């Protein structure tokens, strides 16, 4: 019902007087498969504690995204910290063909077929914040019809 997914674990350091003291950061996205996504970063002294922090942080941070038939409504860009993301609806593109750290958040979002290309930097944290900014940026024909044109037969045509 939740269908969690771990993307990438990084090993960081702190460098105190004694020696370099290591800890681990996780990065997860969770979400049902109807356009709800939460990413949780999370960091702890040990790996499964870190992914567990990332689960509990991801579950209370979800974003509602409106998608029809498991794909986008329109091609949408996205930008966060030098990670530019272009993702495209691909009506039966037949494959969630995105890069690393974007394929995860997309298929736990519930899109099944996009054409997603990640420009700029490819840091997994910044590209997953970029794709969640793009997915929240995308709106629906009932959204743009309810604010413009006042008919989905007029807005779509």
């Amino acid at each position: 019902e939740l269908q969690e997914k771990l993307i990438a674990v990084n090993r960081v350091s702190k460098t105190v007087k004694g020696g370099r003291i290591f800890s681990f950061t996780a990065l997860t996205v969770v979400g049902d498969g109807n356009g709800r996504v939460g990413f949780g970063y999370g960091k702890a002294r040990e790996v499964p504690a870190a992914i567990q922090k990332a689960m509990e942080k991801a579950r209370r941070n979800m974003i509602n995204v409106a998608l029809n038939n498991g794909t986008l409504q329109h091609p949408v860009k996205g930008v966060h910290t030098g990670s530019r993301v272009f993702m495209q609806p691909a009506s039966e593109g037949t494959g969630i063909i995105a890069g690393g750290a974007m394929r995860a958040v997309l298929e736990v979002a519930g899109v099944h077929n996009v054409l997603a290309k990640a420009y700029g930097s490819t840091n997994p944290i910044n590209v997953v914040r970029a794709t969640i900014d793009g997915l929240e940026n995308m709106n629906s024909p009932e959204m743009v019809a309810a604010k413009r044109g006042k008919s989905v037969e007029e807005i779509l045509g």
Partner: protein
């Protein structure tokens, strides 16, 4: 030094939608009242009023449906440094067809969807999404 008044119109629409202003005003012209007339026909903008005799000024009431603005993005396509003309069957659809592209054709200034059933193309002025 003001070499594209159409881009100077669209940057007032965009800066008004950013700055949360009720109305905006630019020095009027025939093309600005035509494009603003198209935007009122579409529903991104209500109530343009041209108000002047010798030095005309046209004002626009800027729409805000939610707390969020209505003009989500607005680009300028046929800038004077690089004019862009399209065929009939090469006219774009902005935001997968739920935005409108303003094109100037020989039957007047209209939208892309209007120019498809009109069966002709021209100078795509802007992309209003």
């Amino acid at each position: 030094s003001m070499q594209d008044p159409i881009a100077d119109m669209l940057t007032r629409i965009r800066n008004g939608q950013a700055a949360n202003k009720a109305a905006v005003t630019m020095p009027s012209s025939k093309l600005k009242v035509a494009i603003a007339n198209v935007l009122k026909e579409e529903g991104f903008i209500e109530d343009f009023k041209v108000e002047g005799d010798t030095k005309p000024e046209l004002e626009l009431t800027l729409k805000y449906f939610q707390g969020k603005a209505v003009v989500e993005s607005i680009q300028r396509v046929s800038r004077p440094g690089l004019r862009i003309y399209k065929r009939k069957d090469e006219l774009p659809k902005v935001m997968a067809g739920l935005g409108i592209a303003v094109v100037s054709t020989s039957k007047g200034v209209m939208t892309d969807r209007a120019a498809r059933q009109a069966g002709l193309g021209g100078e795509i002025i802007c992309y209003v999404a």
